[PDB]
RNA sequence: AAAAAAAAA
């Protein structure tokens, strides 16, 4: 017999129902969390024996949208769900980022969270349910986990926040925000606004968290009811003796080594002190593990840099907290792309290039909720020759498919509606040099490129990453944090919007609790920095160009009869294939008879128009048709005319005189007007050269 | 001028042509076997030096169907043969399963059998030829190998077995089983039958074996002719000292531990026993191999459990050999899937979900034999958390692609014929905890889910996995064998049929010398256990639900006049495309008048059928024909009523005198009755107002 | 391969049928694609020589111009 | 012989 421990509550309008104990009894824990007929079956399995000699914590969070949820057989040719799509990868990252800061420091047991989506309802998005499920499953398992973590989505409708808006409500809403936080404080935010002021976004975050408190309480109750006993796990007791021994020698020398302004001399000096210290550490005692010493060194570096930045001393870069790294924007770097730009800030650099296309190229996304065509593709490539180290290129890693979406959220607030711009922009942005905040450089460069290729966007957008270092009650906010600063910093929060309003937020706090006022101060400082960046960006190019680049495919529209569209299709499309191959353009066919002529140069466009027009032109009374007989035989020569309908001039219809041979009657290259009297349906159109040859 | 060695023999109606020595000389041994113009080129490469510290036999059997065999350029966009399809993986497992228990124990040199298909007569299926080829190759190579193995594919027609039928016959046979065994015993059997009684199945097995004795004899002849000298490979002699100091010190204690009925106490006891034995033996000598120590320990405990079950003592579970594990059955566990079930037996369970789709989703796979459309998809998912360990979710491994086909072979016997039920059932079963006999749990859950979603299958169907332990003349046969028992047990059955007859008989014996009487007894016990499981299943769901779920797309078929399809539809598909884009349903037509209406809503299907009846409106006596005339011209009154139905209203039928303005006597938009006088060949339709106003 | 035969242009309508029932029935029977032009030139495209022979024979039975000395199978259906 | 335009581219 099976004993399903169910526990259901009320969240917003729907009724979440946690249900554990019935399935996957062999995994460490598994709950089937269902909200309003949308069910996600999260399961955790974490090994007990720590891998001998591990350095980084290997938590992986697969997320699978099984397409038998909506009730459809998949569309792929193998007719089976395969490699995870971009949406599923993004939602896996969204599940991953809240929990990882919660696993206690020094934990290195493999842990895997495989949250599938068994059944979906088009009104309720699954991802929020999957997040609740991952939190509940982890809390049940007894793996060392600091807290249950609620998840909420907030929408802005008619100036009142709504919790967990349904998709139909979401279309109306200005802001779509996901706030996931523990009982103590916000843990992550991943938003996409529509140029709201910073106060509205902060209100949204605080509202979402204050509300999801309920999910937290109820998951806690479930854990108390039907959970497993907590693991007996203790962190590695800190070897105070070795740490203090290494510190007594390294503290002052490394403090002064980091005090000096020049970066690379400090690099060399700290590396040589590192080699000296590790050589002594080995020579005095071989048994001491190298990774322990490396952890010690990381601790010393983090401690000294944090102590410095807290006191107000200049950062490792040499800038003040407010100062942004110097920028240099360039446009038209690439010769033949529809529009390109190169946004170099400090060391982070991005070569963004925007290319227009016609409606045939818009991505057609088949996801669980419903079918959807996307007409703004943003791709973000992070090649390994950026950081400075070799590495195999390949399919885009998870972080690239996350930052693509982030930059796309950043830019989507300002793109023009399709009726005003009948194109499908695709923006790529390779990162040639990365030193921190690559995605926001990509947002800036995308604004630049779009402004250059001629898209009539509303106003330039710009993104500036930020940081936070807080100890006790002493806190100081940072701007344009380098990567080295980010590792030491306690929070990284990325705001990207126009001067008027915020287009995209993506906080990721990691330590203790951040009071609302702290977030407010950080957001305001970010507004200032972003205004400065936008000024500099405006210095280069301030208004989008007059028209698209000459290479860009212009749009020409012709009207033809509804039967004519089938005529131009032909067998499987042979006529349109031949037309595109002979003309070199791109033709779109609609059932109402509209024709879309898309070609770069106007000459190819008019070429296509004429070539199609001859076949579209119906043979008209009085107007003679241009026909060339392709084959002549002794018993008659038929003048092939085209259009699927050929009129044959039988040997008995030419003249009453005995036609002896067509060669002396019709010669090779005899282009003569033919008098057509009518258009018949019997398949035997009457042609007559006799009346045209009389004069 | 190298010379091949050719030996050809009769094998049923087909003739087989073994041939070696001409190609692939540098491979260890290669044999091109051709049967009746189907040729499969099998080659085997065997390394000579065992990899150091190798523990498991790394034999890997590949199999590639080169689509230039049938004489066709590949379909795929790259015009090149892609990764192995599901069929090729299936036949790879087919070739693999018989020849793995045949290599001697302790052989660990890598071996690879690559079987290519170079020319395929669309009648003779290749798999049998490839199996004969792999047997001939291995037995030719001189890699240590017990015996050449023959393959047959017995069919069942007119209650008479037939050897190795062709596709044309196979469309009429009830049972197709690939009994491939050496001369001594039937090594492997894989079956698919339409509810044949067990006795017929076992008769087919024994007949196939008696027949393929021929291939055995002649492969032996060819090996004696043109073989290679056998490798000099000797098994590692067992170390009597280690065996004695483990046995005489611990084996009695392990026997007493396995006497304990409880699982967990016994676990703890065997743990402390093995730890104590290891500790004392290393205290005696440290250089003693811990790996070999544990290996001998595992051998000891295997011997203990085998002796226990042989004596007739209760098994590790505590069940008697006959009784099945516990059961629990739930149906409709997911909210929005078309049908679902959760078949949980003992500690092996499966979440099956059947999802109906319209006829456009049927997987169309291109095989060498000929393009075949598949309208029943079974998919088997074995995620890692099921067995309790973390792993790498990804593309389905080989064992899944095998068990999916097994379960589909088990269910296909009972699914309805396409005329009675026109859909595209796709069944997905995800194992959530597996401890032996997972695939048969999947078959049970699939029968349940199908019965839930509302398909009218002919009868419920269930599966049980038998196990056999045999020593000398003493043999005991188990039921619902656990995962742990299976390795220790010798042979494995998987019977899966309705109460009336068997449907799948996959079996995989290892020991040599099982009389057919033993298999008869085993199948009898399996019939008993399967009747029991079906009795339990009968409680939850009795008969298939009358109506499919409201979420299901509903397909409605109407018959129409096949001649009138050209009159109402017309050329070019204009009106059909218009109707499919206005109603959003899919419409097709047959030469007889068969037309299917498929739409995810009932009311939409009603709208579509209304439109079809309006366009296909006959001439109903007494029904009012409404025409809306908005403008009048001198030639007539143009009225748009669809279907090209337009008649020219003559001026002489309006009034006797010349009408100066038509609107004085005929009103605009006024309903005029129109009775058809006759339907001419040229589509001439005339309207009659005068005779229709009064009648 | 592509098989080309020249048939009298006027007799195509005897065998084409109303709405093309005969031609499509024959193609689905022989598994090939037949092509006919207003000049009566019959184009048989096939994926095999054997299907080519099958289709071409079936064309000879009906589609071929009426030949003297060709026997016609006449069966009464009702007395 | 009824019909835009390719994971198986």
Swiss-Prot record, chains A, B:
The keyword Transcription does not apply. Residues 622-690 form the S1 motif domain. Its EC number is 2.7.7.8. Residues 553-612 form the KH domain. One of its GO terms (biological process) is RNA processing. It catalyses: RNA(n+1) + phosphate = RNA(n) + a ribonucleoside 5'-diphosphate. The keyword RNA-binding applies. Mg(2+) binds at residues 486, 492. InterPro entries: ExoRNase_PH_dom1, ExoRNase_PH_dom2, ExoRNase_PH_dom2_sf, KH_dom, KH_dom_type_1, KH_dom_type_1_sf, NA-bd_OB-fold, PNPase. GO terms for cellular component: cytosol. GO terms for molecular function: 3'-5'-RNA exonuclease activity; magnesium ion binding; polyribonucleotide nucleotidyltransferase activity; RNA binding. PROSITE patterns: KH_TYPE_1, S1. It is found in: Cytoplasm. Transmembrane segments: none annotated. Keywords: Cytoplasm, Magnesium, Metal-binding, Nucleotidyltransferase, RNA-binding, Transferase. Gene3D superfamilies: GHMP Kinase, N-terminal domain, K Homology domain, type 1, Nucleic acid-binding proteins. Its main location: cytoplasm. Coiled coil: none annotated. Involved in mRNA degradation. Catalyzes the phosphorolysis of single-stranded polyribonucleotides processively in the 3'- to 5'-direction. Belongs to the polyribonucleotide nucleotidyltransferase family. Component of the RNA degradosome, which is a multiprotein complex involved in RNA processing and mRNA degradation. This is Polyribonucleotide nucleotidyltransferase. The lineage of its organism: Bacteria, Pseudomonadati, Pseudomonadota, Gammaproteobacteria, Enterobacterales.
């Amino acid at each position: 017999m099976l004993n399903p421990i169910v526990r259901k509550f009320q969240y917003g309008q729907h009724t979440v129902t946690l249900e554990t104990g019935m399935m996957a009894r062999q995994a460490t824990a598994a709950v089937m969390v269902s909200m309003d007929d949308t069910a996600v079956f999260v399961t955790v399995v974490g090994q007990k024996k720590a891998k001998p000699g591990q350095d980084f914590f290997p938590l992986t969070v697969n997320y699978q949208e099984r397409t038998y949820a909506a009730g459809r057989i998949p569309g792929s040719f193998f007719r089976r769900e395969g490699r995870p799509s971009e949406g599923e990868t993004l939602i896996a990252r969204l599940i991953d980022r809240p929990i990882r800061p919660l696993f206690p420091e020094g934990f290195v047991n493999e842990v895997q969270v495989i949250a599938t989506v068994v059944s979906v309802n088009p009104q309720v998005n699954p991802d929020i349910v999957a997040m609740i499920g991952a939190s509940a499953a982890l809390s049940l398992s007894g793996i060392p986990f600091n807290g249950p973590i609620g998840a909420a989505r907030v929408g802005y409708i008619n100036d009142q926040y709504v919790l967990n808006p349904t998709q139909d409500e979401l279309k109306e809403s200005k802001l779509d925000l996901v706030v996931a936080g523990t009982e103590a404080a916000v843990l992550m935010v991943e938003s996409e606004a529509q140029l709201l002021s910073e106060d509205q976004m902060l209100g949204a975050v605080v509202f979402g968290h204050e509300q999801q408190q309920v999910v937290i309480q109820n998951i806690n109750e479930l854990v108390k009811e039907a959970g497993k006993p907590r693991w007996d796990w203790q962190p590695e007791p800190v070897n105070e003796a070795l740490n203090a021994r290494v510190a007594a020698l390294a503290e002052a020398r490394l403090s002064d080594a980091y005090r000096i302004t020049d970066k690379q001399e400090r690099y060399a000096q700290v590396d040589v002190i590192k080699s000296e210290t590790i050589a002594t550490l080995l020579a005095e005692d071989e048994t001491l593990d190298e990774n322990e010493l490396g952890e010690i060194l990381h601790a010393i570096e983090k401690n000294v840099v944090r102590s410095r930045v807290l006191a107000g001393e200049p950062r490792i870069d040499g800038r003040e907290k407010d100062m942004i790294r110097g920028l240099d924007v360039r446009t038209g770097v690439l010769p033949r792309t529809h529009g390109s730009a190169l946004f170099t800030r400090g060391e982070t650099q991005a070569l963004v290039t925007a290319t227009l296309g016609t409606a045939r190229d818009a991505q057609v996304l088949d996801e669980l909720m419903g079918e959807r065509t996307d007409t703004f593709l943003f791709h973000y490539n992070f090649p390994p020759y950026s950081v400075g180290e070799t590495g195999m290129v390949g399919s885009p890693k998870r972080r690239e498919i996350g930052h693509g979406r982030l930059a796309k959220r950043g830019v989507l607030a300002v793109m023009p509606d399709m009726d005003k711009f009948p194109y499908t922009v695709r923006v790529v942005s390779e990162i040639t040099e990365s030193n921190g905040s690559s995605s926001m450089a990509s947002v800036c460069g995308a604004s630049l490129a779009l402004m250059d290729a001629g898209v009539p966007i509303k106003a330039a957008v710009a993104g500036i990453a930020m940081g936070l270092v807080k100890e006790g009650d002493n806190y100081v906010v940072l701007s344009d944090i380098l990567g080295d600063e980010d590792h030491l910093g306690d929070m990284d929060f990325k705001v990207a919007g126009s001067r008027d309003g915020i287009s995209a937020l993506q906080m990721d706090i990691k330590i203790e609790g951040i009071t609302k006022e702290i977030m407010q101060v950080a957001l305001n400082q970010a507004k200032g920095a972003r205004l400065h960046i936008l000024g500099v960006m405006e210095q280069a190019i301030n208004a989008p160009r007059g028209d698209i680049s000459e290479f860009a495919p212009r749009i020409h529209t012709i009207k033809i009869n509804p039967d004519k569209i089938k005529d131009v299709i032909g067998k499987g499309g042979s006529v349109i294939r031949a037309l595109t191959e002979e003309t070199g353009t791109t033709i779109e066919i609609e059932d109402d008879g509209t024709v879309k002529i898309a070609a770069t140069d106007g000459e190819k466009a008019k070429h296509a128009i004429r070539r199609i027009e001859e076949i579209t032109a119906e043979i008209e009374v009085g107007r003679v048709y241009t026909g060339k007989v392709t084959r002549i035989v002794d018993f008659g020569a038929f003048v092939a005319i085209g259009g699927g309908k050929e009129g044959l001039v039988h040997i008995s219809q030419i003249a009453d005189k005995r036609v002896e041979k067509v060669t002396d009657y019709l010669q090779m290259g005899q282009e003569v007007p033919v008098k057509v009297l009518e258009v018949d349906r019997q398949g035997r159109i009457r042609l007559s050269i006799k009346e045209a040859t009389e004069q």
